[PDB]
Every structure is written in C-alpha cells, then in structure tokens.
Amino acid sequence: EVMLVESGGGLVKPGGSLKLSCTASGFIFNRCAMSWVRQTPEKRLEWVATISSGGTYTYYPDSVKGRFTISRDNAKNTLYLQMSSLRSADTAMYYCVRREDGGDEGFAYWGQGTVVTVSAAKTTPPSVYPLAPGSAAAAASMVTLGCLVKGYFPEPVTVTWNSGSLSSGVHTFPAVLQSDLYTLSSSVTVPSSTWPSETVTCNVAHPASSTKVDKKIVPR
Amino acid sequence: DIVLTQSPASLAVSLGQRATISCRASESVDSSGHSFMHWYQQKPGQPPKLLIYRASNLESGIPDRFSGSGSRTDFTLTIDPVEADDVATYYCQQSNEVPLTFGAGTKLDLKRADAAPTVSIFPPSSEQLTSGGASVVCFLNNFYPKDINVKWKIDGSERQNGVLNSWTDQDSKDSTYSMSSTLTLTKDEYERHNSYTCEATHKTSTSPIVKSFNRNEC
Amino acid sequence: DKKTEETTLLEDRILTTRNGHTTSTTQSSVGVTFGYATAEDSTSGPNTSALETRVHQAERFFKMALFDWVPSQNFGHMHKVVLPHEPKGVYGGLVKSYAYMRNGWDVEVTAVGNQFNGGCLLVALVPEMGDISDREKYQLTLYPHQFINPRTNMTAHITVPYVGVNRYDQYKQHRPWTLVVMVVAPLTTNTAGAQQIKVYANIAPTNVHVAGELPSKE
Amino acid sequence: TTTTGESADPVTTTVENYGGETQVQRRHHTDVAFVLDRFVKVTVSDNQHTLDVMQAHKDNIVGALLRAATYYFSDLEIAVTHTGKLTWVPNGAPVSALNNTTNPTAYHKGPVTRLALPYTAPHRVLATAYTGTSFNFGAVKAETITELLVRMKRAELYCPRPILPIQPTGDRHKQPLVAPAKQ
C-alpha cells in the first residue's frame, strides 16, 4: 500500500562507495519529504539525511556532511543516498523512511533495509564444524546438538536444521567479530533416539559468497 | 545537539504488570505548542514501529494499553498491562531541531519466573583441529534473569583470553534467554592440556553449574 | 462605462482593455476595481544596485481556466490560486532567466452564463493569503474585490500593484498575490438559466521588472 | 440609495436620507498608531527569547489588531522582569552573541527593566502572513527571564486582514460587565 523497498547494500572496502535506492509505491511520492535513518550493529539508530518535498532543501547531521548525499527522483519514484568515503563506522543497516505527511508526526512507515558492511575485508565463506557431544553427554531424554559456523564476511549466514524440520527447540545466537570476520553458533535439542538413529543435518547458507554447506552430525 | 537519556536500559516485568520508561532531553524539545517527542517499538528484525507521536497521541491503531505524557524534557511511555506481545527495545526520538536525536532504547524483557540454565560443553571437531584450531563451545540455554557469569578452566587453571560470548534476546514463548561461550585455542596448546570446564554461575544456585569433558575420555 | 443607442433589452456599459498586442472588449462591465494604490512604489531600489530593467513584452494578456460553477456548490465554496502559477511564453521566460523580479496584476475574471441565472460570485486578490477560516470568508471584502451577478454583469475586473516586504521577489519561492473566487449565493438555474457556468481568467502581468541575469544552458 | 452593488465602490448613506442629522466623531481611540502603542505580555519559555510581535496572543487587543493588517513597521520598547544581566542583540546576529556583554547589556534594577529598541530587520517592512527567520527585532537573554512585555512605537499598517469576535451561542453574547456593588 504505502511501500518503501530499498536496494544497493553490499560489502565495501574502506574509503569506497555505494549508492542505495529507496523505490517507492502506494502514495504520492513527489509530494512528500523523505529520510534515511541507519541502525548500527550495537542496535542504535542514527538519522542520516532528509530531502525536501519532492524538490530540494537537504539536511544532514555532522558525521555525514561532506561524505553522504540524499537525492530523489520524482520522475521514477526513487530516493537515493550516494555515499562516499565509507568510514568503517558506517557499517550499518539502512532504512528509507517516509518523513512527512500532514505535520510532524514521527517517522511512520519505514522501509525494510539493506545492510552495508564496510570492511577490508571482503567476502569470506563460512567454515561449519558439527558440534556433536563428547561420549559422556548422551543421557536423560533430550540431547542438545550444535553447529559452529566460523569466520565469514559479510553478514549473513542463515542456519536451518534439517532443511526446515527441526524448527522446534533451536537457538541461534547473534554473530560476533572474532577479528573482523564473524563467528555464529546454532544449537537444536533432540530426543535421544531420534539421534543417532536419525540424521540431524545443519543447513548453512551464506548469501554473499554463494555458499550453502551441509554438515551432518555423526557421533562420539 | 539535544541529547535524550532513557531510564531503565532493560527492565524485566511480569505479565499484566505496568512498565514505565522515562526519556530526558538535555534541553527543551517543545516548539510552538508542541512537544516533538516520538516513541517507537523495535521487535528483532522489524523496522521500528511508530507508537506514540507528539508525546501523547497514538498512531493508527496500536493498542490503547499504550500511552505517553511529557512536556519539555521529561517524557514517559506507560504500558499497562504488559502482555507477552510487547517484549522489545523501546526508543524515544525528537524532531524539534536538526540533528534529530534518538534515545538509547530500553530492552523490555519478561520476568518469568526464574529458570536455571541447561549447560552443554562441546569439544572442537576433529576437522577444526585438522585446520590447526580448536574451539571448545559451551551452551547455557533457557534461563531467567539474564545476568549469568560463565568461566573457563583448563586443567583447573582459569582462562580469560579468547572467550567470545553471545546471548539470544528474550524468547517469545517462554521468556528465557540463552547464550554461547567459546574458548578458541590453537590446535597445539589445546593438545597441551586435559580437562576443560565451562563453569557458569547464575542466581538460581549455590553451586556454580559446571560442565566438563576430559580429552582422555574421548 | 456606458453605451448608446438608447436603452434596450440587452447589455451596455462597454469597455475595452488592452495590454500589449492583446485586447478584451466586454459589453457588460461594472467598472474596474483598483488595488491598494494607483501606482507602484519606486521601481528602482538600492536592492537592485540599479541593474534592473523592464520588459514591455511581458505585459500582455494570457488566459487560464478556473472552475465550473454549478448549483451544487453553495456558500463559501471557494477556488483559490497563486499568481503566476505555471507561467508560459515571454512572461514565463523571464522567470527562468532572472534571479529576482516584480510586477502587479491586471485581472479580468469572466463567468459567462446567462441573465436568467440567479446566484452570485465574489472575486478578490489577496496578499500573502494563507488559508482562511470558514468565518473569515465573511470578511473577504477587505480585499480588492468585485462581484459577478448574472442579472447584472458577466465580467469582474480588478487591477492591482505589486506588494511584498521586498522591493523585488524570487517568484520561484514567494508570490504575494493569490486570486480567489467564492460563491456567496449558490447558482440558480430556473427555467431558462444556463445549466452550469464556466469560469475563466484573462490576466496581464503589469509593470514587469527583472534583475540579476542568470547563467544558461539553452 | 440604490447602487450597482457589483461595483465594489464604497457607499455610505446617512440619517439625512430620512431626515436625521449626522453628528461628529472623534475616532482617536480607533487610531492605528495609538491602539497598538501599549504593552503586551509575550509568553517567554526559556531564559533567552527572540523578540517577535507575532507572539502576542491572537485574541489580545494588540495581537488581534496587529493581525488585522498584513504588513507592518514599528520601533520597539520592551519591559522585562529578569535576573542578572539582560543582553540584547540585533536582528541577524549569531545567537552566540547573547552571552557577550559588550552588546547592549543592562544590569539589574528591579522590578522590570525598560528599553527602547530600533526596528532592526533588513526588509522595508515586515509581515503578519506570508505565502512562501529575518522577521524579528533581535533577541534577548538574561540569567532569568520571569516575564516579558513589548510595546510597538510608530506603528504603520498596510492591507487589512479580517478580525473576528466571539461566535455567540444564542441571539447575542450576554456577559458580566463592571457594575457597582449591589448594597
């Protein structure tokens, strides 16, 4: 209905450049003011820029003045944030927000996001190690099993257990930067019987490097 | 720049109770006859959701359990009664004056009753070793309150370096948290030792809950 | 204005207006209302370091439609517009080539229906008009105005000077004049009235002066 | 007295038409320069405040009457009840100036401190409306600003705008008027 889908995210080396687009639908874009807000890793939200009312009077906070430009194309309903001199501080998830309607009333209707990963680091694939238990842990009735994904870049990896099936007591923990390249673990609890007799498999997908990796959990 | 300061930064609250959230601006946020203070709800993986929008008035149709008040500098969200469909990080933000500052958020989580952690320790896989390394990962799952303290031991000797920890946000179902603990060693100093121990201490016990393997029993 | 022959059943009070190579005769005038003055202030101020010039060519008639008056729309129904609006031709060209400019307006609004209609419109020009309340439509007569009333006239004519807190403006972001037309007595149609009335405007930018020639790509 | 109504040309009949006799008037009180030449409270919110006449209450005689015109000119007189040093700064001055004392700064002498200030905008005249910052008389700052009043001197008004009263509930708007004690 109102609709803000942004596009253009990526992995970029420091000092580099990207241009995002906020493609719009379901409202008269050419007559509304527009904003970009980002969300940093440590989950805090910074406003990025505001463009005026389908024409220009552009506004920016200090961190971005000089480096970032907000521009809009009323002819084909697309908002842009061109970004030059990507400082690593700029690794955030970027959102296209419709800024204005009858008045000043918050930022209602927010897009969905594109991530930027400024790292010199470039695309590394994920190492997935089955976390099966030692001999001394198969006991009681439920039995927890795990998946160790290591040092990959950019984020994300999607861990799935059994192509969908064990969507039940599976905990997948937040990614962390061991050294500018991520680790990520996922555990599933299973009835002991189910394993070892039935194959628990870990489905690891890393969009960015065109990797899917499936590791079986085989015991001892 | 106006600075907003939210209090508390995480609160645990029982269902049906009242959670209040204050947000202080360092200098007036009212212009004209309007406070330009806004409150948002961020569920994991959602875009933020506008909730309240000039300190008191609600958006669209978000539940009336939700209200706001405040003039100038002192603003509050009140959720009364808290349902489980409210676990999230809440933010206030101002629109009076560029640069459009944003408060720190407050992660609201659910007091559940206390639940102690299930503790799993995993060796390194034979292949992580083959590539020259070893992570010993511990899992401490489904517990409440989120303040727990895990420890590493290796042959009794304590261990501090190379422990990477991460916590799952509150779970919507059973308002517990979980987390992993990973000691990463090199393959050579890892083989230089025999018992490894994830020792976790959390308020539901007098004992540390300890878990350990012993490379002779592999 | 007046006409001869003698008396008759038709119309008289003839009047021809002329700006540039454009005329506009009207056998049913009611005179012409004059603005807030008879002559504009000094056209050559210090603010222009006297680099200003005047263009005779711009001062000509240009037409632009307003709306259709129908019995439905009753009291207070109003149609407003800010002059220049989208400007074409010579006059338009000026706006694209000069940074600052100024001019007054020669407005001739013509609601051609037929003498058997009842009803009555009020046409005015307003300085810095920013949304009137319902009540203050009643005090619209404080502005340069003129009524159109079918039993009497077909055309309303008002001439007005340039105004503003600045000797010269940047039309591209501030125009002072806003031409409005409002229904005061809803349109009557009776047995032989005209079903509905088409309302147009014949305008001329008066005494156009421009200063500060801009760069150009075409 | 029949007229062509459409004309818009003013018409003013008199009691003489039926035999009466129009008298004399002294509209001193309805004189622009005069009515506006009085103090009006303006709602100050901080301990620093930009001087602007549009801030008078829209239903207050002065503000109501000022808004009954579209363009205006005038000099200012101000009466501030403040604490510490009161500093004024001219239209277009960097806000940072309010702290500097070499600017027109008046020391305390309670209750109020009264000053006469020159129209200081860069336009030939200012406005009540506008169909698009500079529309001010400068700004003031004092450690404490309890109250603020302004007075328009030398007022000039151009182009009249409307001015409405109260919409009565019934046939007329009745109310309590100053009367002597009953006894």
Binding site: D104 | F36 | - | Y130, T133, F135
Partner: peptide, 24 residues
Amino acid sequence: TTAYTASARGDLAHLTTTAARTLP
C-alpha cells in the same frame, strides 16, 4: 512556506508561517 504545524529550525521549517516563525 506552506501552512503548517512545525517549527522554524526543523527540516519542515520551509512550510512554516504557521510556525516557521510566521515570516522567514
């Protein structure tokens, strides 16, 4: 500056007479 409920100094101030402090 259009009509409007906003403030002079705010990204919407270019619509305020309403409250772009009336007048620039």
